[PDB]
Q: What sequence folds into this?
């Protein structure tokens, strides 16, 4: 037996982040870690489309008791489990406290009929060419959004990169990510080129500063790449 639709979770911008691909053999399991910048809401979706509005909502729950922190600071592990019965269990765990809520989604009337499923598979077959470009546009935007807050959260933690950098460079880097964040706020509908170049620009700012500190040791800074849940 195989799962009929790709299972996923909603990420920032109404984006469908896939976890369990369609035609995956049951029983299976898959985890992925996310950053959060607001209410820790986990919206479980079902479909093959890049946006969740065009997919089928299966469930929603919030992870409660996470201490207030700036955007992207808290790290959340999300685990999708399908058993051999088609029962879907979604777990969300705060990586920093062990705080853990789990939702169980059973085969009910909200389960799609094979007619409905065929329609959904066919839909993504038709808009495939347009879904690819749209998906590869939001990816680059997210890769930008990830890098900046990952950097901003690093230079704000004294127990991390923020404890190794001088005040001047720390101020320089903080003002730089602010430029890009404020840019991303007024350019959510930008091209793949603009999102690529914007990330490249931050990297060209981080590099000379990390090189001052760890160039001799051939060390470079990496972005978490983990997606924002928001």
A:
């Amino acid at each position: 037996d195989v799962c009929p639709l790709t299972l996923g979770i909603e990420t920032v911008g109404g984006v469908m982040t896939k976890l369990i691909p369609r035609n995956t053999v049951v029983p299976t399991k898959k985890s992925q870690i996310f950053s959060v910048g607001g209410t820790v809401t986990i919206k479980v979706y079902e479909g093959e489309r890049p946006l969740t509005k065009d997919n089928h909502l299966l469930g929603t729950f919030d992870l409660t008791g996470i201490p207030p922190a700036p955007r992207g600071v808290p790290q959340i592990e999300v685990t999708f489990e399908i058993d051999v019965n088609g029962i879907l269990r979604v777990t969300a765990e705060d990586k920093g406290t062990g705080n853990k809520n789990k939702i169980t989604i059973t085969n009910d009337q909200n389960r799609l009929t094979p007619e409905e499923i065929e329609r959904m598979v066919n839909d993504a077959e038709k808009f495939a060419e347009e879904d690819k470009k749209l998906k590869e546009r939001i990816d680059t935007r997210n890769e930008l959004e990830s890098y900046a807050y990952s950097l901003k959260n690093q230079i704000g933690d004294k127990e991390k990169l923020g404890g190794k950098l001088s005040s001047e460079d720390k101020e320089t880097m903080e003002k730089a990510v602010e430029e890009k964040i404020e840019w991303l706020e007024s350019h959510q509908d930008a091209d793949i080129e603009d999102f690529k170049a914007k990330k490249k620009e931050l990297e060209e700012i981080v590099q000379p500063i990390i090189s001052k500190l760890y160039g001799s040791e051939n060390l470079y800074f990496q972005g978490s790449n983990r997606l924002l849940l928001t």
Summary: The domain at 132-217 is CATH 1.20.1270.10 (Substrate Binding Domain Of Dnak; Chain:A; Domain 2). Residues 10 and 16 are 5 Å apart (CA to CA).
